[model samples]
Target: LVPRGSHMNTSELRICRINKESGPCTGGEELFLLCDKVQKEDISVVFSTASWEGRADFSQADVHRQFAIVFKTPPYEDLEISEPVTVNVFLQRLTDGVCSEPLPFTYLPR
Candidate 1:
């Protein structure tokens, strides 16, 4: 469940950079998302392929945050070779239950 880390909140929640935009096979790679105006911890992040179709993956992000998050892309099930698809990222405030607009990320098969 996505927590409402809203006992605190940031005004300008935005993602500017993704260190590993294109990676091989689902995920299992560490990627950094540069964002600001977040409550720091207990932030919810989800990874999807354009649409909310399929399962879509997410994890509550932790430290290395408050400004930037060290994230690991969850691997897509049953896949080989990088198709180099664009992945959509979503951010949610656990405490407030507020979610941001979808951020587009590039995910590729290797």
Candidate 2:
């Protein structure tokens, strides 16, 4: 849930970079991402492709200084990928359903 002044709706969201841009499709990969200011309790890391979507795993403490976050990637809908697959990753504000511009993440075959 989002608290007041969190600006989940009123502020801008931007993801600057990530420690890793690719991971095994089996998921569970840890990543450190840098971004614009975000409320720890009101934000989510979303990974999506045309036909599927998943969220990164993180808690309140994983959000650091309102500018970075550490989270684990979620498994893709299909775990047995034969080749690399690309997906979109972005920050989502839970309170207002606003999302940042997406970055590309590559999922490698298991």
Candidate 3:
């Protein structure tokens, strides 16, 4: 995962799943892999003032009940939970820095 405050150029980040014990898998289209989350540690303190930007493409992936596209900041693992958490998905661009309304649902691990 990219660290907070890390500058990412266009095409600087890509995602793929690694076998639990093995390294990155080979012999597949690199761009076709599924990315579950992009985590950053201690995000609140690190990215509180800086405007971090990134995007995730889920068109080629499936999100099942146990699956999620997590965007994490401080006190979260980006995907996995360390405590109770909540999330809201919005359809608009948030570049102007306003706290948008929370989406109607809450996500808790099963």
- TM-score order, best first, reads 2, 1, 3
Among all candidates shown, the one with the greatest lDDT: 2
**What TM-score fits each model?**
0.66, 0.89, 0.22
lDDT of 1 by residue, 3-38 (tens): 323222234456666665666555777767777667
**What stretches of model 1 exceed 4 Å from their correct place?**
1-11, 50-62
Residue by residue across 1-110, what tens digits does model 2's lDDT show?
Answer: 33323223333888999888899999999898999999899999999886688999999999999999999999988888898999988899888787787789999998
* lDDT (C-alpha) at residue 39 in model 3: 27
TM-score of 1: 0.66
Worst 10 residues of 2 by lDDT: 1-10
Better of 1 and 2 by lDDT: 2
Error of 3 at 16 (Å): 32
